[PDB]
Amino acid sequence: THINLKVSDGSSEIFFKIKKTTPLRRLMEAFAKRQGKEMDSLRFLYDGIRIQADQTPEDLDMEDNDIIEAHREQIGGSTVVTTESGLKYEDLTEGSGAEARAGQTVSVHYTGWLTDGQKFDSSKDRNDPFEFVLGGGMVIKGWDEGVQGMKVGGVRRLTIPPQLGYGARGAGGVIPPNATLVFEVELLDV
Numbered sequence: 441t442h443i444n445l446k447v448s449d450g451s452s453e454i455f456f457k458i459k460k461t462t463p464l465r466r467l468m469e470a471f472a473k474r475q476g477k478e479m480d481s482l483r484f485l486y487d488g489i490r491i492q493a494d495q496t497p498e499d500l501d502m503e504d505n506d507i508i509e510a511h512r513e514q515i516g517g518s519t520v521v522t523t524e525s526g527l528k529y530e531d532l533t534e535g536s537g538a539e540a541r542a543g544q545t546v547s548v549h550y551t552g553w554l555t556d557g558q559k560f561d562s563s564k565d566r567n568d569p570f571e572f573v574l575g576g577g578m579v580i581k582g583w584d585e586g587v588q589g590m591k592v593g594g595v596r597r598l599t600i601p602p603q604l605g606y607g608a609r610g611a612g613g614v615i616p617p618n619a620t621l622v623f624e625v626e627l628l629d630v
């Protein structure tokens with residue numbers, strides 16, 4: 441009578457247990473509430489087809505552990521860019537404010553995950569924005585490279601290979617050796 445559905449947004453994988461005759465609205469609304477966003481502003485896909493809120497898992501022949509894609513990026517879709525260094529970035533929200541340039545002291549919120557989807561840190565969890573000198577060589581290389589070109593109000597997803605992160609050493613008993621890091625960075629100020 442109930443089903444578990446995996447919702448993947450490109451950063452994490454969250455699961456939802458829902459009755460097969462409950463409209464997907466419930467899942468979509470619970471997902472959106474986590475992101476601080478209105479449900480209608482997000483796009484959910486199952487088997488490549490747009491989910492409508494009034495559809496039930498029964499309607500769509502869903503089964504236990506089926507995957508739903510949650511699209512949080514701009515209407516029209518997005519592209520993930522791999523740069524010369526092997527850093528990947530994806531602009532989820534394009535900023536409209538000042539552009540971040542090397543040499544500025546910038547202020548951000550961030551969340552970091554491992555590729556398995558476990559969360560290792562968030563500035564949100566400390567209610568403490570994070571400030572750093574962009575291009576200063578004091579943060580990991582993927583950050584110095586990846587935050588450049590963001591605009592204030594922007595949300596950018598960085599996928600950082602370990603040579604641009606913590607390499608073979610890892611960090612703080614929470615980042616393992618040779619791990620890719622996934623950050624969402626929201627630019628607050630420059």
Ligand SMILES: C=CC[C@@H]1/C=C(\C)C[C@H](C)C[C@H](OC)[C@H]2O[C@@](O)(C(=O)C(=O)N3CCCC[C@H]3C(=O)O[C@H](/C(C)=C/[C@@H]3CC[C@@H](O)[C@H](OC)C3)[C@H](C)[C@@H](O)CC1=O)[C@H](C)C[C@@H]2OC
Nearest residue numbers: 550552560561562570578579580583605606607611612615
């Ligand atoms: C005196 C030092 C204290 C000073 C600590 C702070 C200002 C508090 C600050 C919020 C860090 C967090 O403290 C809760 C915590 O953030 C993580 O959880 C994290 O999300 C992360 O990965 N971040 C933080 C956000 C920017 C990107 C990245 C980073 O680049 O962080 C940088 C980092 C660790 C760089 C290492 C430095 C050693 C090099 O050898 C290595 O080179 C490979 C790269 C941080 C910002 C350093 O510049 C400055 C510091 O370390 C780490 C997993 C572990 C880290 O705790 C320490």
Ligand SMILES: [Cl-]
Nearest residue numbers: 463465493494
């Ligand atoms: Cl509904």
